[PDB]
């Protein structure tokens, strides 16, 4: 006999701990939640030069996992009657009325099907006026709704519009409404001075300390959130148990679980990627392939609406890596946070190995 917490720690040691030496990663946090029990595993240093250990207070950058909070905020505003996903952005950002982008609906912005939005804002797009000009000069390429092209400006505009519909800045939408509704205590769009001692350095591919800095304000819905391992386990708990939360945030969480279309084996939900469960490892790897992440792909309507499903999301910044995954009917999920990027495939593979080996 070996206690469960030790069995899970041994599986994380076997599958995630070797990644630290393999990719010269300073620090890592891995959390598993199973049947509402949380297991937290911390490795390495949040700051190499300060010899400061990663711990339950360490704040990491979530990168594109930030989009899951934007999606939740959108689900919240929709089920509060503040927006319809059939609305267009010019209904809320009036300067976009009578522009081509005002033909694209909010759901299409949130799920990357406008037809002509690239992965990033151009480097020169920094001010609010440059963002306005960027979207005013947008013209459709592909037929709207036909093609998925993963796009930070696309979901950034969605987040800006959600915020406008709630009459507050997006940072306030998350920090004053969504994070508290989810019970998160150390999640931020802007880390306060009192928490800077807990904000890990990111480390670039030369193991030099860095931190996210760039992009316009309206990129924050795409990659601007920072959080801790306990907070991300609470967020997974909320996604596994939405019925335990008040009606408004319950409905918001459920909105993010609804698949909207497919590209091959991947269901695009709001923020989350969704898959039939059990999913093959290759299905999960394909979601992060160059073909899916970097190129436009024709979308198809959902045919099989999976009763039994799983969800995941990767995220990265220059100096950080994130992976979150959960499986509702196995009552289980996992979060990985690192302060150095490692290949997405390694994150997915390690999590797959751990989750499949944990005893039910």
Author numbering: 1 to 360
Manuscript excerpt for this entry:
One of the most important mechanisms is the production of β-lactamase enzymes capable of hydrolyzing β-lactam antibiotics. Herein, we describe the activity of CR167 against other β-lactamases in A. baumannii: the cefepime-hydrolysing class C extended-spectrum β-lactamase (ESAC) ADC-33 and the carbapenem-hydrolyzing OXA-24/40 (class D). The nucleophilic attack of the catalytic serine on the boron atom forms a tetrahedral adduct, which mimics the acylation (or deacylation) tetrahedral structure of the high-energy intermediate formed during β-lactam hydrolysis. The structures of OXA-24/40 and ADC-33 in complex with CR167 and select chiral analogues were obtained.
The X-ray crystal structures of ADC-33 and OXA-24/40 in complex with compounds (S)-6d and (R)-6e were determined to resolutions between 1.47 and 1.55 Å. ADC-33 crystallized as a dimer and OXA-24/40 as a monomer in the asymmetric unit. In all three ADC complexes, the inhibitor adopts a relatively similar conformation, extending into the R1 binding site. The sulfonamide forms hydrogen bonds with Asn152 and Gln120, mimicking those formed with the C7 amide group of the cephalosporins. Additionally, the terminal aryl ring is involved in π–π stacking interactions with Tyr221. In the S configuration of 6d, there is a clash between the ethyl substituent and the oxygen of Ser64 (2.9 Å), as well as close contact with Leu119 (3.3 Å). For ADC-33, a class C β-lactamase, the (R) configuration in 6e of the chiral center alpha to the boron atom is preferred over the (S) configuration of 6d, as the ethyl chain in (S)-6d clashes with Ser64 and Leu119. The smaller methyl substituent would not result in these clashes with the enzyme. When compounds (S)-6d and (R)-6e, which differ only in the configuration of the stereogenic center, were compared in ADC-33, (R)-6e (Ki = 3.7 μM) was found to be more potent than (S)-6d (Ki = 22 μM). The structures of all three compounds extend in the R1 region of the enzyme and no additional interactions are displayed by the hydrophobic chain introduced on the carbon α to the boron.
